[PDB]
Design a protein around this ligand. Structure first.
Ligand code: MG
Ligand code: MG
Ligand code: MG
Ligand code: MG
Ligand code: MG
Ligand code: MG
Ligand code: MG
Ligand code: MG
Ligand code: MG
Ligand code: MG
Ligand code: MG
Ligand code: MG
Ligand code: MG
Ligand code: MG
Ligand code: MG
Ligand code: MG
Ligand code: MG
Ligand code: MG
Ligand code: MG
Ligand code: MG
Ligand code: MG
Ligand code: MG
Ligand code: MG
Ligand code: MG
Ligand code: MG
Ligand code: MG
Ligand code: MG
Ligand code: MG
Ligand code: MG
Ligand code: MG
Ligand code: MG
Ligand code: MG
Ligand code: MG
Ligand code: MG
Ligand code: MG
Ligand code: ZN
Lengths: 136, 126, 192, 37, 23, 176
RNA sequence: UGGUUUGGCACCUCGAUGUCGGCUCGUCGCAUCCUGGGGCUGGAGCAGGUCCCAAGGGUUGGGCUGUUCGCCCAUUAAAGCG
RNA sequence: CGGGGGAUAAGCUCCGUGCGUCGAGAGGGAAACAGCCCAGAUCGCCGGCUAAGGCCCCUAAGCGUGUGCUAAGUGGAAAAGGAUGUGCAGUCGCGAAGACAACCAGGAGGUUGGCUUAGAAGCAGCCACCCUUGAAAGAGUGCGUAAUAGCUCACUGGUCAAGU
C-alpha cells in the first residue's frame, strides 16, 4: 500500500493513454526485468499483491525493485445517485504504463527459481508481459 | 566426453601399454563393487586393473602389433596391465574368476601373438 | 591485446528521407552514416545480416573495415539504436579512424567468482569508460570476487587493467558492492 | 475426471495425447488423469 | 446482450467499409 | 518407415497369392483375406519376402507404411502358429467349468453367468481355477479376452476377479 | 457468460399501455429433486463428498401474516431454479 | 477527427472542426435498414462506355488462369490461458570417435553429516550442500513405510542403427 503524502490538487483528468514509451525502456540495476506491451493502468493494490507473490516464492535470498508509483488519482462518487451535480471523491490511485517500460527487476543467482518466480509474477498482472535479460 | 578427452584417453592407454610388459582381457559384467574393490586391492601390489572401451582400445592398438586382438573386443571388456612380472597377475585373475564363476577370460597377448583361453591357462600355470 | 578488422560491403544511398529509409529497412537493409575529422559526411547502406553477425561476434564495440566502390576505410560503431519492442538496427554511427589514434570507448565489465553464504552480490555499474588505441580495445573486463565479507566496496580504480589503457572515469566510482545478506523481517518491512 | 479448461503434466509420469479433437493426459495415478472441456 | 453484439459485429462487412450509422 | 523398411520373411510351408490390391494366404492353420489401402502398393520378393513401398514421404504415407507392414507380419505369424491366451481366477468359492462349446462362470453372484463362444475360437480348461482360449485371429482373441476380463469390477482390496499371467494390480489397505 | 433484483439513459405509447396475489389453464430452458448410466475418493459395507451425460414423467396436504418473502406441523423419491 | 461530465457505460450529454450526409435527396451497392460507399433527377428513345459490388442456381456476368495454406463447416460469434497440429524463415548442442529411444550389467563404502524433535537413517523442516573409489552417485525428481527395509531414478557401460 504505497500512497503519496500530499499533492497540490487532489484530482486530475483521465490519464493519457496513447503513444509509445520514451524513457526507462532498458532493464538496468539488477539482472532480470519485466516489460509490458499493452496499455492499461496499475494500482497500489495490484503492486502490493505482485510484490507479496514474488516475495513468498523468493523466500530467503535476493532482493527486488519497483520502478513505478500509483500517484495519479481517480475519482468515484457515492453510488445510487443522479449523475452530475458535482465531482465525486478520490478512491483509488493508479499509474499509467506504456509499451517498453520496465516494471520489476530482480537479482538471484539461481536462474531457474528466478525465472519461475518471475513467471508467477507475470501470470498475475492484468497486462500481457514477458521477461527480459540484462544483456542486449 | 569431448574429443580432446577421447584423444587424451587414447594416448594414456597407449603409453600404459607401451610401458607394460604384457596385458590380458577380461569380462567385468555381473560383478559387485565390493568384489571389484577386493580384486583391485589384491592386484595393486604388482599389476594394474582398469576398464577400457572397445572402439578406443581398437584405435589405440594400431600403434603396436596388438591389432590382432580386435576380434576379442566384442562385448564388455576390462583391461589389466602387468608393469612387473607376468604370471602373478594371471594367477590372481584365474583364481578370482574360478571363485566368482561370473568372470570369463577373453584372452591375452604374449610374444607378439594372440593366444586362446587354453594357451592363457597353460602359460599362467607355467 | 590485438584484434583484426572485419570486412563488409556497402552502397551509397540514392534517396534521403524517412520513406526510402524504412523502405530499405523493410527490404532488409540498414541505413548508416559515417563521419569524422575528415569533414566529409557520407551516408550508405549495410547488410543487416553481416552487421548483426559482426556485432554478436565482437561485442558492441568492434573494428570494421568497409568496402565502398572499391575504396577501403576503417570505422568504429560509436553509437547504436535499438527498437524497444522489435529489436531492429535502424541506424548505426560510423567514425572513421586511422592507425594510431586516441579514442573514447565505452566498455562493459563482467563479474564472476564465489560468494560466501552470508553475502549478496550487486552491480550498480555495468559499463566503465576506458580510453586506449583503436586496435587495442579490450572486448570485456573481468573482476574476481572470493571470500569477501561485510562491506567490500570495490572501486573502478582498484580494477586491474591491461597495458596501453587509461581510466577516464573518476576512480571514486563504485562498480561492485557486496553487503550482508538480507533478513525476512526487514525485507518485508521495506515499502510498507 | 477432473475437467478444467487447462491441463498439465502434474507429475513426471503424465503423458499427453490427442483424441477426437480434445487433448487430455493419461497417467498411472488417477489423480494425475484429467481431461479438458 | 445477444441483440447488441449482432449489429456492432454486422458492421464489419467489407461492403460498408466498417463505418455505419448507430455503431 | 523405420519399421516398414524390413521385408517380412516368408516360411516355406505357407502359400501366398496376390490379386491386385486384395491378398489371401493359405497355410496349415487355414486361410484369410485382406484388403490393402490404395496409397501404398505391395510387392513380393523372389527371396520369399514381402516388400511394402510408399510413393511419397508425407504424413499419411509415413503412417500407413508401418501399419501395413506390421499387419502383414501379424497375419502371417497368426496363420503360421496362431494365438492362445491363458486365464486364472483368484478368490474363495470361485469356479469355472466347460460345457460343450459354451462356457459358464461363477463369480459369486446369485445367478450363474454364461458366455457364448463365437466362431473361429475354442476354449480350453485344464484346472478349475485356470483355463485358456485359443484362436487364429489376434484381434478376435484380444476382444474375447477383454470381454471375459470385464465380467467383474476391479477390486483393489482383495483382488477377486480374473487377471492375466503377468498382470499386477495395485492394492491399497483399508484400516477400517 | 445472464440480463432475472437494487441501479444510470429518457427512444416508441397522457384525443388512455387498467393495477399486486389467488383461482383455472398452459408452454419453454437446464445452472438436475427423484427416477437412469458412469468415474475419483482421507471409498470395510450400508451410508457419504465431488465431477460428467441426460429434460420422458412427477413434484402433497395444513397453521400464521393480504401478503411476495418467511416460520412451523405430519409423509413420501422429491415437496427443483427460472 | 481533438476534448470534458461518466465506471476510460450507454442508440447519453456538453464543446471545437471553410467537415460529410439526412433533415429539405430518387437511383445502384450491404436481405430487409433516412444519418455508411458511388453517384446530383429539364423531357423522350426496344442505343453505346463506366465508379461502388459481383460473376455454381436462385440472380447478369469466370463450377476464370498461374503459384502456395486449410481438416476445422475454422470459412459463417469474443478475451486471460493451455497444448507432441501444421508450413516458412534462424539458431547452438550432439551425431559414425555409434546420436535418441528401446532391449543385459553396476549403481557401493565415513554415511544414520550436524540442529531439530518420541522420531529425522535421502527424501516435516534449517546449514555446508563436504569429500572418497570412479564410469556413477545429486545431502537425491517423486510415487514407500510411524522409523528401518525395498521399487527406483539421475550419469554411465553391452546390441541396432541417424537424426535429436
Ligand atoms: Mg520522460
Ligand atoms: Mg495481465
Ligand atoms: Mg490451475
Ligand atoms: Mg463508439
Ligand atoms: Mg421521448
Ligand atoms: Mg413516438
Ligand atoms: Mg400516443
Ligand atoms: Mg379511457
Ligand atoms: Mg393488461
Ligand atoms: Mg392490473
Ligand atoms: Mg448440464
Ligand atoms: Mg445418481
Ligand atoms: Mg463425491
Ligand atoms: Mg434433467
Ligand atoms: Mg415422454
Ligand atoms: Mg392473517
Ligand atoms: Mg471522439
Ligand atoms: Mg470521451
Ligand atoms: Mg438527448
Ligand atoms: Mg451540438
Ligand atoms: Mg442534400
Ligand atoms: Mg435516399
Ligand atoms: Mg435502396
Ligand atoms: Mg440533372
Ligand atoms: Mg464494359
Ligand atoms: Mg472496381
Ligand atoms: Mg445468367
Ligand atoms: Mg471455381
Ligand atoms: Mg500456388
Ligand atoms: Mg464463423
Ligand atoms: Mg481468442
Ligand atoms: Mg500459453
Ligand atoms: Mg543404474
Ligand atoms: Mg557426508
Ligand atoms: Mg531437514
Ligand atoms: Zn502423473
Amino acid at each position: 500500500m504505497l500512497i503519496p503524502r500530499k499533492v497540490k490538487h487532489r484530482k486530475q483528468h483521465h490519464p493519457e493513454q496513447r503513444g509509445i514509451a520514451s524513457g526507462g525502456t532498458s532493464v538496468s540495476f539488477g539482472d532480470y526485468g519485466i516489460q509490458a506491451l499493452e496499455h492499461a493502468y496499475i494500482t497500489n493494490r495490484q503492486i502490493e499483491s505482485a510484490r507479496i507473490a514474488i516475495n513468498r516464492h523468493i523466500k530467503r535470498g535476493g532482493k527486488v525493485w519497483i520502478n513505478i508509483f500509483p500517484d495519479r488519482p481517480l475519482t468515484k462518487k457515492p453510488a445510487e445517485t443522479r449523475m452530475g451535480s458535482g465531482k465525486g471523491s478520490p478512491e483509488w490511485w493508479v499509474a499509467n504504463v506504456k509499451p517498453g517500460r520496465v516494471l520489476f527487476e530482480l537479482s538471484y543467482p539461481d536462474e531457474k527459481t528466478a525465472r519461475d518466480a518471475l513467471t508467477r509474477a507475470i501470470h498475475k498482472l492484468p497486462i500481457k508481459a514477458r521477461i527480459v535479460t540484462r544483456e542486449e | 566426453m569431448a574429443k580432446a578427452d577421447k584423444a587424451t584417453a587414447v594416448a594414456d592407454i597407449a603409453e600404459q601399454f607401451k610401458a607394460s610388459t604384457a596385458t590380458v582381457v577380461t569380462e567385468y559384467r555381473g560383478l559387485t563393487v565390493a568384489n571389484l574393490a577386493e580384486l583391485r586391492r589384491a592386484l595393486g601390489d604388482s599389476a594394474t586393473y582398469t576398464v577400457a572401451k572397445n572402439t578406443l582400445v581398437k584405435r589405440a592398438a594400431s600403434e603396436a602389433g596388438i591389432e590382432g586382438l580386435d576380434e576379442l573386443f566384442a562385448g564388455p571388456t576390462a583391461i589389466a596391465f602387468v608393469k612387473g612380472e607376468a604370471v602373478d597377475a594371471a594367477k590372481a585373475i584365474k583364481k578370482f574368476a574360478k571363485d566368482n564363476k561370473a568372470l570369463v577370460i577373453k584372452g591375452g597377448y604374449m610374444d607378439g601373438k594372440a593366444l586362446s583361453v587354453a594357451d592363457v591357462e597353460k602359460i599362467a600355470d607355467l | 591485446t590485438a584484434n583484426i578488422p572485419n570486412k563488409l560491403t556497402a552502397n551509397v544511398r540514392t534517396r534521403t528521407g524517412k520513406g526510402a529509409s524504412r523502405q530499405a529497412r523493410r527490404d532488409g537493409k540498414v541505413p548508416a552514416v559515417l563521419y569524422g575529422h575528415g569533414t566529409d559526411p557520407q551516408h550508405l547502406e549495410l547488410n543487416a545480416r553481416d552487421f548483426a553477425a559482426v556485432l554478436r561476434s565482437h561485442g558492441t564495440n568492434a573494428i570494421l573495415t568497409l568496402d565502398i566502390e572499391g575504396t577501403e576505410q576503417l570505422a568504429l560503431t560509436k553509437a547504436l539504436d535499438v527498437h524497444p519492442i522489435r529489436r531492429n538496427i535502424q541506424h548505426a554511427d560510423l567514425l572513421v579512424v586511422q592507425r594510431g589514434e586516441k579514442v573514447t570507448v565505452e566498455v562493459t565489465v563482467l563479474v564472476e567468482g564465489d560468494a560466501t553464504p552470508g553475502t549478496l552480490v550487486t552491480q550498480d555499474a555495468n559499463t566503465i569508460e576506458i580510453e586506449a588505441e583503436a586496435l587495442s580495445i579490450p572486448e570485456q573486463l573481468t573482476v574476481s570476487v572470493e571470500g569477501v565479507e561485510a562491506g567490500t566496496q570495490i572501486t573502478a580504480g582498484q580494477i586491474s587493467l591491461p597495458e596501453g589503457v587509461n581510466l577516464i572515469s573518476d576512480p571514486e566510482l563504485l562498480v561492485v558492492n557486496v553487503v550482508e545478506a538480507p533478513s525476512a523481517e526487514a525485507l518485508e518491512e521495506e515499502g510498507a | 475426471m477432473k475437467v478444467n479448461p487447462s491441463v498439465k503434466p502434474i507429475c513426471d509420469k503424465c503423458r499427453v495425447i490427442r483424441r477426437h479433437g480434445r487433448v487430455m493426459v493419461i497417467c498411472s495415478d488417477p489423480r494425475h488423469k484429467q481431461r479438458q472441456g | 446482450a445477444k441483440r447488441g453484439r449482432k449489429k456492432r459485429d454486422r458492421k464489419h462487412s467489407k461492403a460498408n467499409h466498417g463505418k455505419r450509422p448507430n455503431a | 518407415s523405420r519399421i516398414g523398411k524390413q521385408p517380412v520373411p516368408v516360411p516355406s510351408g505357407v502359400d501366398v497369392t496376390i490379386n491386385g490390391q486384395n491378398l489371401s494366404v493359405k497355410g496349415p492353420k487355414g486361410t484369410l483375406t485382406l484388403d490393402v489401402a490404395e496409397p501404398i502398393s505391395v510387392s513380393r520378393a523372389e527371396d520369399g519376402a514381402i516388400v511394402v513401398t510408399r510413393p511419397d514421404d508425407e504424413r499419411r504415407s509415413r503412417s500407413l507404411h508401418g501399419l501395413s507392414r506390421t499387419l502383414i507380419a501379424n497375419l502371417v505369424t497368426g496363420v503360421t502358429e496362431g494365438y492362445t491366451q491363458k486365464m486364472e481366477i483368484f478368490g474363495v468359492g470361485y469356479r469355472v467349468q466347460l460345457k460343450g462349446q459354451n462356457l459358464e462362470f461363477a463369480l459369486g453372484y446369485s445367478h450363474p453367468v454364461l458366455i457364448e463362444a463365437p466362431e473361429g475360437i475354442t476354449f480350453a480348461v485344464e484346472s478349475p481355477t485356470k483355463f485358456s482360449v485359443s484362436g487364429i485371429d489376434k484381434q478376435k482373441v484380444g476382444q474375447i479376452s477383454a470381454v471375459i476380463r470385464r465380467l467383474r469390477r476391479p477390486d483393489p482390496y482383495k483382488g477377486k476377479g480374473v487377471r492375466y499371467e503377468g498382470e499386477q494390480i495395485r492394492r491399497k489397505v483399508g484400516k477400517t
